[PDB]
Amino acid sequence: IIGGEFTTIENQPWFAAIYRRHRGGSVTYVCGGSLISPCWVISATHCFIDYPKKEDYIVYLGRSRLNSNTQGEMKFEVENLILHKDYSADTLAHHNDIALLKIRSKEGRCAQPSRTIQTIALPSMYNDPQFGTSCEITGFGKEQSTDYLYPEQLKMTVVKLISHRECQQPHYYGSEVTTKMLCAADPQWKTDSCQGDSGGPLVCSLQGRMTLTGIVSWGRGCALKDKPGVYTRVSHFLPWIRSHTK
Ligand SMILES: N=C(N)c1ccc2cc(C#Cc3ccc4c(c3)CCNC4)ccc2c1
């Protein structure tokens, strides 16, 4: 996250921290995720497509820091890694950038909801917020494009949704951004999501309800003028999520 503020897991209890085990036993951060039910974490397929072995991943719930065992945190393995069969990448745009991770403790249990571990509600079909609506993003992603390290402490920011017609303008993304994608940015281009925030939530309060409106997917640079953050529009994927969690 570029700009914004440092936060803790109690303010974002649906936030899942996803890591990968490498050969030799070292563990590194991959992407964010969101708890949608006790056994299921939703993320972006582009985070896993190059390393599709479920046994390699570690998922934490209730974790506030990248290298700290936050009190009350829960560690899990991936029982089922589901990638979207029509996922594809263009030079900029990612298509069908959505993934599901079925989680399991070493005892074979799913998440136990607590003050720091809670689910996030899915959106309803054809009911996304209007352009100009303020929404929040969370992640352990880069603080600056030139950084190679990720922040130790979890961050958050607030951005505004951008219309499809504004996002399709020539100086923005043209025809490369589609109706299955949602644009969101800072009107002053100072805060945004960035590399490492992928797979993480775009949470919008709509009609009084906190909703998983988007999943961090792609963008040209980070916090660049006329280059919004692009998110998977979760409301389009409700039949796919239902079928793969049944
Ligand atoms: N401006 C943004 N909001 C934004 C949002 C998401 C981003 C995501 C990345 C990235 C990445 C990345 C890095 C490594 C690999 C993949 C993707 C996909 C498959 N191969 C590995 C970089 C900049 C990003 C910028």
Establish whether domains 1-12+120-235 and 13-119+236-246 are of one fold: yes
- CA–CA gap between residue 128 and residue 182 (Å, rounded): 10
Q: Which amino acid is at 11?
A: N
Q: Which two tokens stand for residue 207?
A: 């009609």
- Chain centre distance of CA 38: 17
Report in angstroms the alpha-carbon separations of 156 from 13, 178, 234, 239. 13, 26, 20, 29
Q: Are 16 and 99 in contact (CB under 8 A)?
A: no
Give me the residue spans of the domains in the chain. 1-12+120-235, 13-119+236-246
Candidates 34, 43, 64, 198; catalytic one: 198
CATH tag, 13-119+236-246? 2.40.10.10
Q: Verify whether residue 243 is a known catalytic residue.
A: no
Residues 6+ apart with CB under 8 A from 26: none
Which ranges of the chain does DSSP label H, i.e. alpha helix? 164-167, 238-245
Q: Which amino acid is at 142?
A: K
Residues 19, 157, 120: CA angle, nearest 5 degrees: 60
Torsion of CA 70, 33, 205, 96, to 10 degrees: 170
Domain 1-12+120-235 class, CATH top level = mainly beta
Residues 6+ apart with CB under 8 A from 50: none
- Chain centre distance of CA 205: 16
- The residue to mutate among 138, 167, 195, having the most atoms of ligand 1 within 8 angstroms of its beta carbon, is 195
CA atoms within 13 A on the CB side of 202: 33
Q: Which two tokens stand for residue 138?
A: 């969370």
Count of helix runs (H) and strand runs (E) in the chain: 2, 15
- CA–CA gap between residue 72 and residue 74 (Å, rounded): 7
Q: Give the pairing type, strands 181-185 and 229-233.
A: antiparallel
Q: Which two tokens stand for residue 109?
A: 């249990």
- CA–CA gap between residue 194 and residue 209 (Å, rounded): 26
Dmax of the chain from CA atoms? 53
- CA–CA gap between residue 135 and residue 155 (Å, rounded): 14
Ligand 1 lined by 73 (C-beta under 6 Å): no
Beta strands in 173-228 (DSSP E): 181-185, 201-206, 209-218
Q: Other C-beta atoms within 10 Å of 92: how many?
A: 14
Ligand 1, atom 6: closest residue by C-alpha: 218
Tell me, in Å, the resolution of the deposited structure. 2.0
Q: What atom of ligand 1 comes closest to residue 145's alpha carbon?
A: 23
Q: How far is the CA of 47 from the centre of ligand 1 (A)?
A: 9
Which ranges of 38-145 does DSSP label H, i.e. alpha helix? none
- CA–CA gap between residue 12 and residue 233 (Å, rounded): 20
Residues 51, 52, 55: CA angle, nearest 5 degrees: 95
Unique residue bearing structure tokens 């280059």? 227
What is the DSSP secondary structure assignment for residue 190, as one 8-state letter?
-
Which helix or strand (DSSP H or E) is residue 57 part of?
strand 57-61
Residues 6+ apart with CB under 8 A from 81: 48, 52, 53, 54, 57, 99, 100, 101, 102
